[PDB]
């Protein structure tokens, strides 16, 4: 009865095998039955994942302010803060970049219901900006708006540390209280997801086997250009960015490699952040890293590490905008992966996350998720998004081991 | 300072309240009843059916987690396999004894000068999908009913697992979320108190415009009701509670014996929880060990099922019935099993009869603001006081016919 | 960093100025257009709180004063507040009536004055108190249903509290536990807010000068003057009598008091000027375990200060709209008001987040473009009207202390 079976191979065996389902009842077979009847169970994954995105967004940007939030953070935070902050910089950069040499999304011009999808363009700035600021912020955070329910999170997060600092302890525990139970909600949020993803085996296999078998064979060479572009701008993070910081503070990148080599496979093989965690420890152990370094940077990478996410968000932004036929410019690109990212502190692992920001992206784009084309397109990522989410955690342990070494040698 | 037993106030209100209305109804002014004396009824209606989202989600996260593997303890796994399947036979008499008596048909309501249509019914695939809340926050938000069962199952599990966690930042962050969202559904539970203060008054108004109005065939018809259910009442204590005390070599004679004043003592309380200090001393008197009915005893007062489901099983048929639509066995299990199975942690909890019925009838299509259904419905209302007398003693009944059984299975 | 008083008071005089100047000869327009949107980030800013301040300030304040979880010496400071806030909205009232605050300018901003929607059955009107769901009443904005949704919750925790099952017990604690640092993290959102205000209120009223004419700086001194001299005949109708007539001597007790009102009048803060007012309470010669419990309730609870506040803006904002209000609407408006501003005392700048409450209450939605101008107004001038405003709360909290040590 019972599959304790590796997560991740049940997804990746659901994806590999669905596709081949698919596609052989595409070419002499019934591209409608699927969509009938094996479709429904895919739809039932899209719900079960965008059910989560407003209450992890929101309850895990209260705790995420509140870990950032100064003068609450020490002085030992306050630096590799620093660090993340200049490395999503750069991620968010090679993100578009990669987006950008491959091309994912032209060449599949989707029209599902027999009409192309026509994105509604845009409130006036004046009024676009007004509108981040939430009328009211229960009522934001009741009906899915997005940026509104961004600006609440952080506002709060912000204002509870600030209530930690006050002399009056009846302020101070009432405030430990509350975000004490914004976490854990977060907290019961990403179990959840756990849950989900034992499903996702099924619902991947269903949402791909419709793809395959109504848009063709064209569609498995464009996920493939998505995963590339994804990949060696992974590795390209680390080259360029990660030994280069290595290199500019005196630590050797190969040997340091050699030690975090099974540490980075772990979280390639487990997604987890937090499940990798003892494995990263232990390697920041063997660089030999002070105990009182490690012990509070890397719980904190695991959060609010955004450059991973950031390569991710930058290729399945371009990629989800291109296949429905909307041309995309550099400056909506990082207006968009910047929201994303911005919006994504305090989420790195989380098992899904990738994914999940995706949706918030859409919501808050205009593209709304029940329209045939969006749906039709985000269950493509949505299929690979278990092969991106394995590159993604990995470069997060990779980024948070050379940011521990970074500030444990300034130390 | 009316300080007076609440119980005899509802009663006094209802007796009064019949002949005040029907008096008023044969030579008397229907018309001026409805529109001085039902507005009165009007608030008792909207101050239940307010507590209805609160009660049902918060409820349902303790229930939840009070159940839930494996958290639960195999003294307790023993005893919930045992209100499992004592509910299986409550749901089965519930149906039962509401097709034998037939409440409902005789009056047909056509308040507005038309009888109630009701609207049927999104294709099966549309209205699983539709369980998954899009968006949990919403679906709290604006009354989804089916969703909010959904999430606030899945939340109360998650919650437990972690509670698991050798992390006690994670531990004690799900131990202050579930402790407040508990309180929460504590304090339901004590406004529930308040407004059945109210409910002399309110109840008075309701019965008095329906009998005002609906003539004096709805007294025989509110009687059917009230056999129906004490009829089916007793035969679950003689069918079941006996019959499982004998297979398990307990004397049903005796029992009741001791039991013979904590029965009492819930028949004219309601309250489970008010009952507990009388049911714990009498598992003594039955020689019940401490360990045992110290923790049995307050999971019966919340995650017993068979009571409503008999009061469930007898209000569905008959509200449905009097609005002129006829029920198949099929949909009342499917409309009564959707009540029971969301009305864990909510067994006293003073008018969770009259509560989850109003949750009922949202979920299945029948707006409460309609004129037919809202008079149906102020009927059960009027009568609800009456049936939860034997709603509870039924309940503390099987809970001291689950502990007998379960300490006998221990030492 | 900058003294946060200051920085608004110097907006508003600024602010002001290049209006007026870039009204006679200027472009209304063009203020309009570039200044306004400011102005308008600012308003938004504010009537985002008013949900949440509303609500988890309404269950904790329930909780304070709520039976019998409040001591024997909290129930006679409680009939204190209750009977001096009852002459406050006498006079917030009858100040509002004696200055004609609001006539004067009829303001028609679309090419079309604001006509006020009227007004469901007293039964469907009062049915709809209850919120037939709490969430969403939370949700979407019900204000008199979340007021009274807050209200019942807070009673029922405090019931919770006096239970013998520690499970409940403890259960109840952490529930208004996290309501509470909730009301408490949504005043220091204000705080930060309200270091926008400077650019913010410069913003509003540049555009109220630029475009209603210069008639609107001596409308704004109507409403200062009405609230300044109904604060001050608080203080010495009923504070002053209330004093004299439990044995203190008035003249000798302003002595004392001398610097604490003047540094809440230039603070704005209750909890600021708290250390202030403990030091001039020993002073006078309270007990210390008298003193250390009722000025911290004081600060909270004082609703005597808000009372004036909402007496005379509620009158300005509807008579400006030109619709005329009578003395009975009036009370019904501000009891309303001031029973849903129990625990927001301060709280920086209560009395404009209350004023919005009580306009999405009434019907007039803030979108409105006449509605959000005679609101800018008051939103301009607030930081003024809130130094007296806290100076009376501070003032009426030593009078209670005085009095109900003297009773002990
Ligand atoms: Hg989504
Ligand atoms: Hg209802
Ligand atoms: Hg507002």
């Given at each position: 009865?019972?599959?304790?079976?590796?997560?991740?191979?049940?997804?990746?065996?659901?994806?590999?095998?669905?596709?081949?389902?698919?596609?052989?009842?595409?070419?002499?077979?019934?591209?409608?039955?699927?969509?009938?009847?094996?479709?429904?169970?895919?739809?039932?994954?899209?719900?079960?994942?965008?059910?989560?995105?407003?209450?992890?967004?929101?309850?895990?940007?209260?705790?995420?302010?509140?870990?950032?939030?100064?003068?609450?953070?020490?002085?030992?935070?306050?630096?590799?803060?620093?660090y993340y902050l200049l490395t999503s910089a750069f991620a968010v950069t090679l993100g578009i970049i990669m987006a950008?040499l491959?091309?994912?999304?032209?060449?599949?011009?989707?029209?599902?219901?027999?009409?192309?999808?026509?994105?509604?363009?845009?409130?006036?700035?004046?009024?676009?900006?007004?509108?981040?600021?939430?009328?009211?912020?229960?009522?934001?955070?009741?009906?899915?708006?997005?940026?509104?329910?961004?600006?609440?999170?952080?506002?709060?997060?912000?204002?509870?540390?600030?209530?930690?600092?006050?002399?009056?302890?009846?302020?101070?525990?009432?405030?430990?209280?509350?975000?004490?139970?914004?976490?854990?909600?977060?907290?019961?949020?990403?179990?959840?997801?756990?849950?989900?993803?034992?499903?996702?085996?099924?619902?991947?296999?269903?949402?791909?086997?419709?793809?395959?078998?109504?848009?063709?064979?064209?569609?498995?060479?464009?996920?493939?250009?998505?995963?590339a572009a994804v990949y060696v701008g992974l590795t390209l993070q680390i080259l360029l960015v990660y030994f280069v910081l290595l290199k500019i503070?005196?630590?050797?990148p190969?040997?340091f490699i050699?030690?975090a080599?099974?540490?980075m496979?772990?979280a390639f093989?487990?997604?987890?952040?937090?499940?990798?965690?003892?494995?990263?420890?232990?390697?920041?152990?063997?660089?030999?890293?002070?105990?009182?370094?490690?012990?509070?940077?890397?719980?904190?990478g695991?959060?609010?590490n955004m450059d991973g996410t950031a390569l991710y968000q930058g290729v399945?932004?371009?990629?989800?905008?291109?296949?429905?036929?909307?041309?995309?410019?550099?400056?909506?690109?990082?207006?968009?992966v910047?929201?994303?990212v911005?919006?994504?502190?305090?989420?790195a692992?989380?098992?899904?996350?990738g994914?999940?920001?995706?949706?918030?992206?859409?919501?808050?784009?205009?593209?709304?998720?029940?329209?045939?084309?969006?749906?039709?397109?985000?269950?493509?990522?949505?299929?690979?998004?278990?092969?991106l989410?394995m590159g993604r955690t990995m470069v997060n342990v990779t980024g948070d081991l050379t940011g521990?070494?970074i500030?444990?040698?300034?130390?």
């Amino acid at each position: 009865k019972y599959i304790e079976y590796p997560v991740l191979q049940k997804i990746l065996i659901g994806l590999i095998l669905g596709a081949i389902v698919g596609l052989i009842l595409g070419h002499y077979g019934y591209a409608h039955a699927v969509h009938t009847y094996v479709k429904p169970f895919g739809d039932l994954f899209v719900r079960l994942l965008c059910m989560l995105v407003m209450p992890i967004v929101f309850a895990s940007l209260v705790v995420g302010a509140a870990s950032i939030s100064p003068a609450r953070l020490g002085r030992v935070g306050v630096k590799i803060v620093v660090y993340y902050l200049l490395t999503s910089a750069f991620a968010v950069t090679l993100g578009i970049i990669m987006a950008r040499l491959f091309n994912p999304g032209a060449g599949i011009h989707l029209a599902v219901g027999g009409q192309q999808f026509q994105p509604h363009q845009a409130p006036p700035l004046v009024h676009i900006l007004l509108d981040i600021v939430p009328t009211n912020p229960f009522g934001a955070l009741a009906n899915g708006q997005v940026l509104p329910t961004i600006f609440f999170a952080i506002i709060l997060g912000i204002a509870i540390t600030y209530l930690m600092n006050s002399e009056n302890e009846k302020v101070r525990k009432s405030a430990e209280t509350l975000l004490d139970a914004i976490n854990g909600l977060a907290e019961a949020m990403y179990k959840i997801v756990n849950g989900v993803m034992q499903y996702a085996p099924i619902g991947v296999f269903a949402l791909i086997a419709y793809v395959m078998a109504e848009q063709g064979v064209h569609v498995v060479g464009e996920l493939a250009k998505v995963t590339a572009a994804v990949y060696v701008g992974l590795t390209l993070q680390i080259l360029l960015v990660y030994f280069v910081l290595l290199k500019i503070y005196g630590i050797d990148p190969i040997s340091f490699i050699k030690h975090a080599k099974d540490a980075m496979l772990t979280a390639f093989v487990t997604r987890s952040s937090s499940g990798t965690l003892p494995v990263t420890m232990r390697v920041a152990k063997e660089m030999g890293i002070s105990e009182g370094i490690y012990s509070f940077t890397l719980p904190l990478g695991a959060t609010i590490n955004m450059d991973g996410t950031a390569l991710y968000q930058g290729v399945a932004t371009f990629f989800i905008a291109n296949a429905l036929g909307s041309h995309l410019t550099v400056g909506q690109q990082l207006t968009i992966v910047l929201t994303a990212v911005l919006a994504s502190i305090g989420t790195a692992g989380v098992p899904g996350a990738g994914a999940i920001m995706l949706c918030m992206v859409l919501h808050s784009v205009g593209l709304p998720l029940t329209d045939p084309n969006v749906a039709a397109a985000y269950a493509m990522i949505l299929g690979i998004d278990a092969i991106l989410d394995m590159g993604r955690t990995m470069v997060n342990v990779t980024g948070d081991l050379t940011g521990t070494a970074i500030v444990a040698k300034t130390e």
